[PDB]
Each structure stands twice: as C-alpha cells, then as structure tokens.
Design an enzyme around this catalytic site. Structure first.
Site, PDB file in Angstrom:
ATOM      1  CB  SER A  47      -2.754   8.516   9.128  1.00 20.41           C
ATOM      2  OG  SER A  47      -1.753   7.553   8.840  1.00 20.41           O
ATOM      3  CB  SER A  95      -3.536   6.416   5.546  1.00 17.75           C
ATOM      4  OG  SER A  95      -4.840   6.785   5.948  1.00 17.75           O
ATOM      5  NE  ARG A 227      -9.712   3.176  12.202  1.00 16.18           N
ATOM      6  CZ  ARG A 227      -8.782   3.277  11.254  1.00 16.18           C
ATOM      7  NH1 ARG A 227      -7.666   3.964  11.468  1.00 16.18           N
ATOM      8  NH2 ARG A 227      -8.968   2.688  10.084  1.00 16.18           N
TER       9      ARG A 227
END
Ligand SMILES: [Cl-]
Length: 242
Positions: A47, A95, A227
């Site tokens: 993405s 996303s 992340r």
C-alpha cells in the site's frame, strides 16, 4: 554522506523482529540507517504504492479531486472500513485496496508503466495484473528508493502537475501538533515472501525536513502497530521529535 549505526538494530530485535530504518536530513544532505544492505533491498511496495497511484490518477483525470466519492461496490470484504463510500483522503487513510484497484484499471498498463518510469519509481516494472501488481506482481522498491521518490514529491519535482502533488501530500497527512507534521503512508505485504510492513514519509519541522523509510518483518498482523511505534522511537532517540 551515509552512516550506518548497527546499534539501532535493537529497536527491532527487542521485538523479536528484524528490519531497516532509513533517515535523510534534508538540510545537511546526510543519511542514516541501521543496515545499509537491507536499506537497498527491494520489496513489494504494497500500500505504499498508493502514493504514486494517487498522483497518476489525479494527473490523468481519473480522480477529479480529493472530494470525489468512490461508491462502495456493495461487495462485503473482511476489512469493515472498506465496506463504505470513500474519497481520496479516506481511501488513503484506510488503505482501501479495491478503490485503488479501480484507479489502476482506468489508468491502464501503458500509462501506468510510462508514469512510473517518469517517476524513476523502484524497478519501474508493472509485470503482473494491472489491478494487483503492487501486491503480487513484479514491481519492487527499496527503502532508499522510497526516500528518493518522496524527496521529489516534497519539492514538487515529479513529472505531474503541482496541483496533483499538493493533493497527494494533503492525503498523506498522518499526524500534526505544535512540534511537527508527519506525512506518510503505511504498507503491508503478505502475498510474496518475506512478509513485511512499511512506513514511509517525512517529518516537517520549523526549519528542516527529515525523510524516513522503514520496513520490518511482519509474520502476522499482530505486529502492524510496531511500524509507526518503532519509527517514532528512532525519531525521538535522534532528537528529531520530542
Ligand atoms: Cl495539509
């Protein structure tokens, strides 16, 4: 110009993971990473590809503006936030793959290939299905290549209109407060090994910008929050953000 700090590996190994963070100081034109090799290894963009896909869709008129509504096709998918209408802002925030899959069909193979070449984006290879190549096709990009591309976008230097670039940077808005602004995009690649998560973007300060690109091993979705969390830990350690 480039410094490697292997002690930064602890950010990943403390979570029984492995990965790479790449930072670029725009004012000083200097880069920093925990792992020069992995910084230059190419992975599926997943993405994070919504950044170039958005730019191309806008510049060709597939997407009129950030308010245009892309109606849910009425097919129930397993991500609840996908079962609703979206605009460019919310589609990037959640996303929403099926919206961008339709963008890609309308862009088409020929125009998509030419534009990625114009962007110098990754290996510029769209081999695979036009509506899924960034998930399970031949396209690949490294963390250092993400930073090169993002720097062009920041400076409005990509070969699309200034308007298209301004709209995509608006849609990338992720966090803002009195100390900094983050514009970024997450990615999650599961169809081709190794499974990884991405976060790429930059941090705007009063008098500098720091670009970043990170990926990390992601054997299950349980680790996706790492992340952003790890990246921000690195930024704090390096005194880029408080
Ligand atoms: Cl904005």
């Amino acid at each position: 110009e480039w410094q490697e700090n292997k002690s930064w590996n602890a950010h990943f190994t403390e979570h029984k993971s492995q990965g790479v963070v790449v930072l670029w100081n725009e004012n000083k034109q200097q880069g920093f990473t925990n792992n020069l090799k992995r910084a230059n290894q190419a992975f599926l963009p997943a993405s994070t590809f919504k950044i170039p896909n958005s730019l191309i869709a806008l510049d060709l008129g597939v997407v009129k503006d950030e308010h245009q509504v892309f109606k849910w096709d009425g097919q129930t998918r397993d991500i609840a936030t996908w079962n609703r209408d979206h605009n460019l802002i919310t589609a990037m925030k959640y996303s929403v793959v099926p919206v961008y899959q339709e963008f890609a069909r309308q862009i088409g193979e020929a125009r998509m290939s030419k534009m990625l070449h114009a962007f110098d984006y990754g290996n510029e290879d769209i081999s695979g299905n036009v509506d899924s190549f960034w998930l399970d096709g031949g396209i690949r990009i490294s963390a250092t290549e993400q930073i090169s591309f993002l720097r062009k976008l920041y400076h409005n230097k990509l070969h699309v209109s200034e308007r298209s670039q301004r709209i995509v940077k608006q849609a990338m808005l992720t966090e803002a407060n009195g100390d900094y602004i983050i514009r970024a995009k997450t990615g999650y690649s599961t169809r081709i090994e190794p499974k990884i998560g991405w976060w790429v973007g930059w941090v705007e300060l009063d008098d500098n910008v720091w670009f970043f690109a990170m990926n990390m091993d992601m054997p299950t979705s349980d680790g996706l929050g790492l992340r952003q969390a790890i990246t921000k830990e690195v930024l704090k350690q390096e005194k880029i953000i408080p």
